[PDB]
């Protein structure tokens, strides 16, 4: 509810990288909360957006994107080269219970660390 | 790569529910692998599909859906009432390194168990 400084822990290929986030307000036009890493240049900030919805049927989505940049020799400022987009979209109904909603997110969260997807993302192997 | 019987562990609101999956072949029309729980009636099966792509830019998606059903009194067979859809879509580029790809999935996997999203999914509170 009251969004705060969410800090992750032990993430990315070795468990040796941490991450902090700071809130960056709520966009009143569409109700999308944002979180960002306190970087140096605001163009280079690992951004995480989250938005629940209202009715039809319920809808939750999380859009997370990380840019990487390299210093082009023709300029002094760094320029953004590429991103890595990702997003989840949960869709429930009016009659969804609490346990049945929690089952989905915990299944997805534990399935993202399976020996299937670590081969399907880090090396892009099909099945 | 070689997909096998993926078993999860300690998932959903208490850590007391486990889950097993069995492979159900690869659809040759679009290259979408499938996994399912060995249920009684095949209409009631918690299904998990995963598909990496090829080029443009790379694309990985995981579509997971769980149905729930109740026995209507007018019939003997159970009928499906509602689902709980979910899907992730990772998008990388040609020049994405290994570490930078793993960072995204581990950040998402550890962020799905934050004290932010457990309030944003299990009670659907906004921020």
């Amino acid at each position: 509810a009251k969004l705060e400084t969410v800090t992750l822990g032990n993430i990315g290929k070795d468990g040796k990288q941490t991450l902090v986030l700071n809130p960056r307000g709520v966009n009143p036009t569409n109700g999308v909360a944002s979180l960002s890493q306190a970087g140096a240049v605001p163009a280079l900030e690992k951004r995480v957006t989250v938005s629940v919805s209202q009715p039809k049927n319920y809808k939750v989505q999380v859009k997370i994107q990380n840019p990487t940049a390299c210093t082009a020799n023709g300029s002094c400022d760094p320029s953004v080269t590429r991103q890595a987009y990702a997003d989840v979209t949960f869709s429930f109904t009016q009659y969804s219970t609490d346990e049945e909603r929690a089952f989905v997110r915990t299944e997805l969260a534990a399935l993202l660390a399976s020996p299937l997807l670590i081969d399907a993302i880090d090396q892009l192997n099909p099945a | 790569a070689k997909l096998e019987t993926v078993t999860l562990g300690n998932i959903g609101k208490d850590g007391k529910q486990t889950l097993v999956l069995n492979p159900r072949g690869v659809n040759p029309t679009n290259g979408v692998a499938s996994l399912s729980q060995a249920g009684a009636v095949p209409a009631l099966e918690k299904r998990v599909t995963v598909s990496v792509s090829q080029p443009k830019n790379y694309k990985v998606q995981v579509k997971i859906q769980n149905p729930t059903a109740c026995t209507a009194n007018g019939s003997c067979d159970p009928s499906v009432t509602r689902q709980a859809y979910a899907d992730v879509t990772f998008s990388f580029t040609q020049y994405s390194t290994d570490e930078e790809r793993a960072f995204v999935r581990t950040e998402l996997a550890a962020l799905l168990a934050s004290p932010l999203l457990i309030d944003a999914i299990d009670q659907l509170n906004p921020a």
Partner: antibody
Framework: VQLVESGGGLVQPGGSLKLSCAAS????????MAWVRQAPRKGPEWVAF????????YYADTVTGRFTISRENAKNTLYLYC?????????????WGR | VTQSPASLSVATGEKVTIRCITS??????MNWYQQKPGEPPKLLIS???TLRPGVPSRFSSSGYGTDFVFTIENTLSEDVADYYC?????????
């Protein structure tokens, strides 16, 4: 800012215990932690490093029971020495309990 | 897989060499704790050469993958206690 262990001392061979460990002002989020006790002959034993968010868990070679769990209700951890790592993600750790 | 040399004290006015050698891989991170016989231990200069405050500047180490040397100073003060070495790779991590 400290942190203190608690637990039994006369367990029967075959049974099990539940070590408790309470925090004292590092807010018990934001920070990973671990269990390591010692024999009376040698100090640094195994590690069962918990995540910050109870996501990345792993136990050491002596895994038969010995489950680590973290609950942010009374800032304690349950387990069936109690140390914690620093702010940056790493695997060294600095503060200790008795 | 780590290893430290045998127990020694020599004198109360000299340095002492402690060799942490590791046969698994190459490491940039190798930490040192000290165990006085009254309390649970306390770290020092870990991640190579950080030297977190609370410990005096007399302590030192150097090294790299598969070789680390730890040494202090001459006229080293009293109340010796044993020193332990461990690592931050390979999740059991000794």
């Amino acid at each position: 800012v400290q942190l203190v262990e608690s637990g039994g001392g006369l367990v029967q061979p075959g049974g099990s215990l539940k070590l408790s460990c309470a925090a004292s002002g590092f807010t018990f989020s934001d920070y990973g932690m671990a269990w390591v006790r010692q024999a009376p002959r040698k100090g640094p034993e195994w590690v069962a490093f918990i995540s910050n968010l109870a996501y990345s868990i792993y136990y050491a070679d002596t895994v038969t029971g010995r489950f680590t769990i973290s609950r942010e209700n009374a800032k304690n951890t349950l387990y069936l020495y109690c140390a914690r790592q620093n702010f940056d993600s790493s695997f060294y750790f600095d503060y200790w309990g008795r | 897989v780590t290893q430290s040399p045998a127990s020694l004290s020599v004198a109360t006015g000299e340095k002492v060499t402690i060799r942490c050698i590791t046969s698994t891989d190459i490491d940039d991170d190798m930490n040192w704790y000290q165990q006085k016989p009254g309390e649970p231990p306390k770290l020092l200069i870990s991640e190579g050469n950080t030297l977190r405050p609370g410990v005096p500047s007399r302590f030192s180490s150097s090294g790299y993958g598969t070789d680390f040397v730890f040494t202090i100073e001459n006229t080293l003060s009293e109340d010796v206690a044993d020193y332990y070495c461990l690592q931050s790779d390979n999740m059991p991590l000794t």
